[PDB]
Design a protein around this ligand. Structure first.
Ligand code: TR5
Ligand code: CL
Lengths: 101, 112
């Protein structure tokens, strides 16, 4: 991964490309605060969590996902969570299927 | 009224409601793709996530916290998945913003 694979950063979060992409466009939004799982977020995280979704949405627009995309958050083993730090997946650039896994 | 979710919100169409407050409503999906599958929707009728604005930041965070609390109450302690579909390629079909919460079975990868 190269520094340009960081698509966006601010005081609250980072956005970077997934090096194992499951779609033509596939990136990751994380908080700088190490919330390990969404099930362990608390009430104080409310603004931060809202901020992550807006950043996901803005980055999707900036990456050309105007025809549609999917946001995914995985929790625990059953969610297939692969790293114990909160990630929002953004996938686009192809037809997403249903069910979502 | 933009979608059938307007009928669930105004209670003219009876749904299996799990949680409600002034900013949102939670109910079971009528075509579940997992043993537990419910939807978290705002009462404010944002049609899709791509059309949310910065003024919606507090509401969005609230929807996620409500998803996580309801997951806990539904017994999804071994894990689950949260999904938001936008537009045609996202496979969105009801044009009222909502978070899918799926649990009770191993979810696969990729996520569709
Ligand atoms: C009463 N009623 N009527 C529907 N047509 C109806 C559709 N849905 C679900 O709404 C979801 C829409 O998700 P997207 O396809 O991502 O928009 C699907 O999972 C549908 O199964 C519902 N969930 C609860 N109650 C429902 C419905
Ligand atoms: Cl993950």
């Amino acid at each position: 991964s190269l520094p340009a694979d960081i698509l966006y950063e601010d005081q609250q979060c980072l956005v970077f490309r997934d090096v194992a992409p499951q779609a033509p466009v596939h990136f990751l939004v994380i908080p700088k605060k190490p919330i390990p799982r969404i099930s362990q977020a608390e009430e104080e995280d409310q603004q931060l969590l809202g901020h992550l979704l807006l950043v996901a949405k803005q980055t999707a627009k900036a990456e050309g996902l105007g025809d549609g995309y999917r946001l995914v958050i995985n929790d625990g083993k059953l969610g297939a969570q692969s790293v114990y730090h909160l990630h929002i997946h953004v996938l686009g650039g192809r037809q997403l299927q249903w069910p979502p896994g």
